[PDB]
Structure formats: structure tokens, C-alpha cells
Amino acid sequence: SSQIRQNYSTEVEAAVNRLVNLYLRASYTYLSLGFYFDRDDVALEGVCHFFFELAFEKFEGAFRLLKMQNQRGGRALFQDLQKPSQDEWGTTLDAMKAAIVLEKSLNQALLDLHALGSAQADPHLCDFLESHFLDEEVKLIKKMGDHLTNIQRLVGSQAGLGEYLFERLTLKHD
Amino acid sequence: SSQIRQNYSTEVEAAVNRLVNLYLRASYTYLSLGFYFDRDDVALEGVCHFFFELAFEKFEGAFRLLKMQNQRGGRALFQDLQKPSQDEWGTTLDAMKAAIVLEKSLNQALLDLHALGSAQADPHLCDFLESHFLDEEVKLIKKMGDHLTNIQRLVGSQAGLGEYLFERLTLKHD
Amino acid sequence: SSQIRQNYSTEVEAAVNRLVNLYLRASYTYLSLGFYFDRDDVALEGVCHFFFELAFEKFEGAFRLLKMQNQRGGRALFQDLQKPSQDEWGTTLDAMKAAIVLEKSLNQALLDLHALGSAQADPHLCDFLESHFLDEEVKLIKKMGDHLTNIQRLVGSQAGLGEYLFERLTLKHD
Amino acid sequence: SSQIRQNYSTEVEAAVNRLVNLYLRASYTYLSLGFYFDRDDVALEGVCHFFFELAFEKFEGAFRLLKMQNQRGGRALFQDLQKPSQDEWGTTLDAMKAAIVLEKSLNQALLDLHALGSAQADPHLCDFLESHFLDEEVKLIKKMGDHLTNIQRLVGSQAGLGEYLFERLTLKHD
Amino acid sequence: SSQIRQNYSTEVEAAVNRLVNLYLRASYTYLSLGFYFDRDDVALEGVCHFFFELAFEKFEGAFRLLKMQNQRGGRALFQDLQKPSQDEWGTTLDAMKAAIVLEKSLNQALLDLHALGSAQADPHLCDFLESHFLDEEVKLIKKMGDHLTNIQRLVGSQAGLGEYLFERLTLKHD
Amino acid sequence: SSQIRQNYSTEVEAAVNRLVNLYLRASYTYLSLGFYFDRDDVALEGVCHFFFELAFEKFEGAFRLLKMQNQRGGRALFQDLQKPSQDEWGTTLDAMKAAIVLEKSLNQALLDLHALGSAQADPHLCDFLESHFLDEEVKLIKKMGDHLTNIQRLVGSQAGLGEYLFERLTLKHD
Numbered sequence A, B, C, D, E, F: 001s002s003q004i005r006q007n008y009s010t011e012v013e014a015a016v017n018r019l020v021n022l023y024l025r026a027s028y029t030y031l032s033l034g035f036y037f038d039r040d041d042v043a044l045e046g047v048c049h050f051f052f053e054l055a056f057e058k059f060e061g062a063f064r065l066l067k068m069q070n071q072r073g074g075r076a077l078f079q080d081l082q083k084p085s086q087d088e089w090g091t092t093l094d095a096m097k098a099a100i101v102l103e104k105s106l107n108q109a110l111l112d113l114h115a116l117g118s119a120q121a122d123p124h125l126c127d128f129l130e131s132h133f134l135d136e137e138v139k140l141i142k143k144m145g146d147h148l149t150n151i152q153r154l155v156g157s158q159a160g161l162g163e164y165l166f167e168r169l170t171l172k173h174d
């Protein structure tokens, strides 16, 4: 079959294709989050830009997985992409809670693939995830946790005021 | 009569002169809004500057219509300009609600003139409006809608605080 | 009432609002003059540009009066703006004669307001007019008088030739 | 037949080829006008340069139509090009009157093609004409009308003097 | 309901959401085409880069439609995204034939939406498509047709040689 | 009659007008060749650009002849321009064979005019042709002969391959 494939299990090849679908799903979810915060009746520019940056970051992760699939001699297989879980995303707090749930699901999928690679004695796969995915995910989840705490402290008795101030003074706008 | 006029109906010529009056009326309304927010007992610099920019934008639209009237060989005719609807404009929220009502009236006048041009098979007129007016109006109304939503979220129990913060952190001052 | 108003009579406040209307009327008159000289059957670019510059200058005078009204703690009040006295403005000579009549009417209104300020012992008002209006008006009327004399000397037996040459060789075009 | 053609009627394809012939005819007419004003017994450099620029502008319009024909998958077909209507073009006034007649004939051909495209529900064709032809034609006809008025005012009793002055002081020489 | 929506039908709003799904489907198809040509057993870098550029171009079209949806006050609604029609894309000729079929399907969807906008007297929608989509699509389909002709002429008796040469000497690499 | 004409025969004047028609015919032929190679079903960019450059070169020759006609005091007379000999131009080899036939016809017309000028003892005419036409024509015909030989050597058993390679590796594109 493949002229280059070496030490690359069918189990890892399949799991990489599944992980691509999870990252593209996440990218699509962040595209929906971004456009919700762009609505004229939501209108939180910094929140919109935060989620569009994450849509691009998740697409880049999918792209890197697909490049690696070909580098190892596996076959990229694309499946249908389910639409995001919601059409409307509530407050910035609701959205950032949904985002951290989504990132922890990606992080668990990364850890599960690392464990499969470990079991299959596939050190290139394990290094690839460690070098391009695990720390990026830990750093993003820490950032989201920091944002959740600041959003929560700003709710008070004046939720609209707090949501405005967080978008203006923490998030980047423009 | 005219050495240059071609495919330019008397109906469109008249409607263009009426639209100039509507844009000059709008410009005058925004000059009044700007000077109200400059009062020492109102004193919202970013709101003042927002409305002065719109006074200049509406004057530029009138100027472009008048230039086009002459380019087509119609006769610019000026009528009396009514004063604005109010002498005092209330809160930033009141003013931005009046502004969006005014812009939707200009937008409907643009759409009505486009429909007349369509009926008269006047593609230069229809292109002129599409290229210099329709999208500028859609973008401005979207901006005003974004501002209305942010102003509304800041009212809370503390209207003065919200009105200050919106002027400081969204509007341009510096 | 006003937290800042000091030595600012109701008579001056009202007269300033009237003077704003006169300057905006003058600006509108110069916008009409400019577009008449832009017609394809008139086509005197330097004359068109001369009058558009004066439309902007008169608007700036209105703007400065309105800023001063607020600086003194008076209330800017806008009234309807009458359309210009003519729809068609004849020759460059006819137009420049109408312009000098209009400027002498503005100059008399300035002198009348200065005399009211003098009577009311309002030195800020009298200084404001002296510093931003009286000499600008004297200089403009002198310029118009210079232009009238040159236009008149060029009529001769060959009015079209003279009107072309004045526009080409005295007025600014591109 | 064509691998790219989509929504492109045979009626529009044929009309585009006819319009190319009209623009090339116009270009040839302006080449003849330019060389007439270059004669040592006519010798009006600014008039010569005005018409050579229009010869190049009309050729560019033909070129853009031909490029569009291929972009849509139609077949460019060239026909014989008739010589211009005159061998000698009289005065600058005669020439500019012939030019405005020629431009209004091109403008009507543009409007007729736009109406055909409209009837055929061909929005690419209608946009192409609006974006590259209709406003360029309106602006050129306005310019020619401005020039006709200035040429006419300079005839007076001294036609040679006026024709010299217009060439020297309005037209570009280098 | 919407504070900004004006002249924006539910029919157009729905059709825009469907068109977004078609553009995202097309983007996903081009991502699959790109990674197929990146395989070590296909290895045509210029073909890979051609299709990745188109994946980004189709995503940008989806993004612009979604921005416009919000500008008009409609609600962006995302649906499931079907996977591409093939897992393996054959030769460069097979792939470029599939690409032109896909682009003509997008072009027909654009023309159908333009016709709906026309019927609904929605000139902003019709201008938006003309200005950002119709000519981009005509130009891309012309490019693909040019490439199909060059690929076809290179097949000869030596298909591998021709496929190499086209990738090396026409497409951008590295 | 002419104030400048000296040593300029009616025979040369007429022959110059005929030669202008031949150069404009040649320019039109090259415009048709260029647009044929721009077709999506021909698609040879370097061949398209080669022939468009020659269309411009032939127009420049016509322009120089017309300038010279006026410099000598002859009268430029334009005649109808026949359409090119073909609507479709076959292969690059067919087109380059037609081009060399066309250039040798122009070269013979140049040599015939030089011989007339010689017979009429018109050294300015003979120098003009030698300095701006004869060597340009010899150099172009040599270039076309070089191209014909390279095109012919590339036909082999694989005409499509050869036609691609010649366009890619000899002609200017991208």
C-alpha cells in the first residue's frame, strides 16, 4: 500500500480523522458564536472578535492534523459536520461557559489520542500532540477560566453594565 | 432644451430635488443634535462629535445628488428647509432613537427613488444610488442599532452612569 | 437656570440665534450659486468654486456663532431656513452683484449685533465679533468689489469673451 | 458547446459584438478628428490632444467589451469598420457638436444593451455596463456640454480669437 | 422585532442562509481536494495550493454573506454541512472538471438569489451580489475553463508527463 | 494650396494614405488574433500577449505615417477598414504562418513606397521609411521565422504538448 507509512496504526489514522471532525465542528461553533455577538441586538464587538479568533485557531488545528495525516501516510477522510449545539448563545457568560465545555471536550479527545499513541508506541504522534496541541489547549482553558471569573464578578445587580464593561475593558476591539 | 440630457425623466429630476431637501433637512437635524450635546448642562463630547460627523455625511449626500442632477442635465431647485423636529433632544438614547427613525426615512426615500428609476429604465440613476447611498445607509443603520443595544444595556438602575460610560468608552472624544 | 451664564443678555442670545439663521441662509444661497455655475449650459468652473468656498465660509461663521452661544450659556434655537432669492443667477456680473448685496446685509447684521453688545456692556461678544467676523467681512467685500470692477471692465462689446477670460485668468480652477 | 458559458444569451452575445464595432468606429472617428486638428492649416494642439485621448478611451471600451465576451464564453466576431462620417471637421465648435452626437449614439447603444440584459435576466452584463460604461459616458457628455457652452460664449464677433483662446486656456497642451 | 430591518424579506433571509451552507460546502470540498493533492502518492503541489486558495475564497464568500445578513437585520442560521461528494478526486483533469461543476452550481445559486432580490425589489441585495460575487464567479469559471483546455491539450499519449508539466509550468508552487 | 508642402508628390501622399489603411488592417487582424488566443477553449496567454503587442505596434506605425503626412502638408484620408481574413485562427503554427504572410505584405508595401519616393526624388520620405519602418519589419520577420522553426520542431507526434511548451517557455506570460 503506502510507500512512506511506518509505525502508523490504523487505530491512530482513524482517531486523527475523528479529531479533525471535532476541530472543524468547534471551528463552526465559534463562527456561529462570533456572528451571534455581531447581531445588532447583541452588539458586543470584543466578544465577536474573541470567538472569530477561536474559529480560526480551531480550523488551524484541523489543518495541522490533516497535514500530519498525509506526512504519516494515512488517508484524510472527511465526514459530515454537524451544526453547532445552539442557534442563539445567550449572554457573554453563557457563551464563555459553552466555550470552556467545548475546549475541555477537545482537550479530552487530545488526551485520549495521546494515550492511544502511547499504547501503539507511536512517539511521533505523541510528540506532535505535545508540541502543537496540549499546551495550546491548557493555555486557552486558563484564559477562558480567567475570563469566566471576571465576567462573574461583574454580574452584581447590574448585569448589562457588567457585560458592557467586560467587553470594553478586557476584550480586544476597534 | 438640454444639450446633454438623455434618458433622464422629469419624474426622477423632481424626486432628486426632493431627496436633496430631505438630506439637507437631515444635516440640519444633526447640526441641532450636535449643539445640544455641546451644551454645558448636557456635556457629552463623544455624542456631540457623532452627530456633527453625521451632519457632514448628510450634507455630502446632498452635494453628490446635486452634482449628479447637473451631470444628467436636470435643474437643481432648492426649497425652504424646515427646522428640526425638536429644540431639545433628551438623553443619548432619545437622540439615537430619533436618529435611527430619521435614517430609516432617508433609506425609504432612497428605495422609492430606486424603484422610480427602475420603472423609468434609468440604469445610471439606479447604479448611482446603489454605489453611493444604499450600502452607506445600511451600514449606518446597523451602527446605530449596535449603539442603541449598548445604550439600552447600560441604563440599568443607574442611567447617568450608563450614559457617561457609553460616551467615554464607545464614542470618539479628545 | 444656567450654571455658567454671566453678563449674557437675553437680547444678545436671541440676536445670535437670528444671525445664525442669516449665515445659514447665506451659505444656502452660495450652494445654489455654485450649482448654477456647474450647469452644462453655464459652465464657469472658477465661478462655481468661488461660490462653493463662500458657502463653506458662511457655514463656518454659523458654526462659530453656535459654539459661542453654548460657551456663554445661551440656548441655540434653529428656525426654518428660507430658500435663496433666485433659482437662476444670470451672468457672473449678476451673481457677484447679488453676492455683494448679501455680504453687506451680513455686515450690517454684524454691526447691529456689535452695537447691541456695546449697549449691554458685553465685551466678550464685541471682541468675538471683532476677532472672527468684522475684518473677515471687510476683506471679503473688498475682494468682491475688486472682482466687480474687473468683470465690468471686461464686458466691452464682447460679454461672452469677457466672462470667459475673467473665469480663466482671475478665478481658481483645475 | 462552451464549457464556461452560463446565463449568456445569443442576443446579448450578438449585441456585444455590434457594440464593439460602434466603439471601434468611434475610436476611428476620434483618430480622424485628432489628425484634422494637427494639420498645419488648422493647428489647434489642445483640440488635437482632446480627440486623440478620446480615440484611446473608445478603443479601451472596445477592448473591455471583447475581454468580457470571452469571460462569458461568447465568440468575438469582428466586422468591417466604416470610415468616419467626414474627412474635414470644420471649427472646434463643429467638431465638438459632432463628438456629442457620437457620444449620445454610444450612450443610447449602452442603454439598449442594458435593457436587453435586464430582459434576459443577465445581471453580470447589467453590472458590467453600470460599472465600466454608463457613468463614464454621463461624465464625458457633461464635459462636452461644458466645452460646447464655453466655445459658444467665445464666438462673439471674433470667432478666430475665441477659438484660439478656448484651445489655449481650457484644453491641455505643451 | 428588528430595530434595523428594512425592505429585507423572509424569502431573501432564508435564501442567504441556504447560500452560506452552499459556500461552506464548497469550501469543505476544496479543503478535501487540497489534501488529496498533498498525498505522497499524488504529490502535485501547485494543484494542492490552487484548491486550498479556493477553500479560503469560498469561506470568505460565506463570511461576507453572514456579515450582510446581520447588516440587514436577518438571523444567521447554520445547518449541518454535508461532506464532499468524493473521498478521492482522480487526476488533475477529474478534479478541475469537478471544480467547474461546483462553481457553476454556486453561480446558478447566486443568479437565483439575484432574481429573488429583483422580484422582492431589494436593490441592496442585488448590488451586494453584483459587487462581491457575480464577477468574481465569472472570472473564476473563465480561469478554470482556461486550465481545463491546457490540461486537455497536455494529455496526448503521455498523461503523467502532461499532468506534471501543467502543475510545474501553469500552477503556483515553491 | 499648402503653405508648407515642398517636394511632396500627390503619388506619395496617396500611397501614404493607402499604407495607413494596410497598417490599421494589420492592427485589427492582430486584435482578432489576440482575442482568439484569449478564448477559454484556446487559452494560450503568451500567444494572446504576442499578438496584442503586434496590434499596438501596427497602430503605432499607422500613427507615425499620419503624423508624417501632416508634417509634409499632405491630407490624411481614412477609408473603410476591412475585417480580418479569418474569424478563427487555428493553432499557434497556423496563426504565426498567417502573421508572417501579413508582415511580408506590409514589408512589400514599404519597399514599393520607398521605390516611389526614390523615383520622385523624395529623400525625406525614403529616410523616414528607412529610419522607422524597414529595419523594424526585418527584425520582426526574423523573430517570426525563429518562432515558426521552434513551433515546427515541437509538433512531433504530440502537437498539444508542443503548443503548450512553446507558449510557456518561449512566449512572455504572467
Ligand SMILES: [Cl-]
Pocket: A082, A083, E080
Ligand atoms: Cl446536529
Ligand SMILES: [Cl-]
Pocket: B082, B083, C080
Ligand atoms: Cl417645520
Ligand SMILES: [Cl-]
Pocket: B080, C082, C083
Ligand atoms: Cl423664501
Ligand SMILES: [Cl-]
Pocket: D082, D083, F080
Ligand atoms: Cl461609410
Ligand SMILES: [Cl-]
Pocket: A080, E082, E083
Ligand atoms: Cl452527504
Ligand SMILES: [Cl-]
Pocket: D080, F082, F083
Ligand atoms: Cl473583407
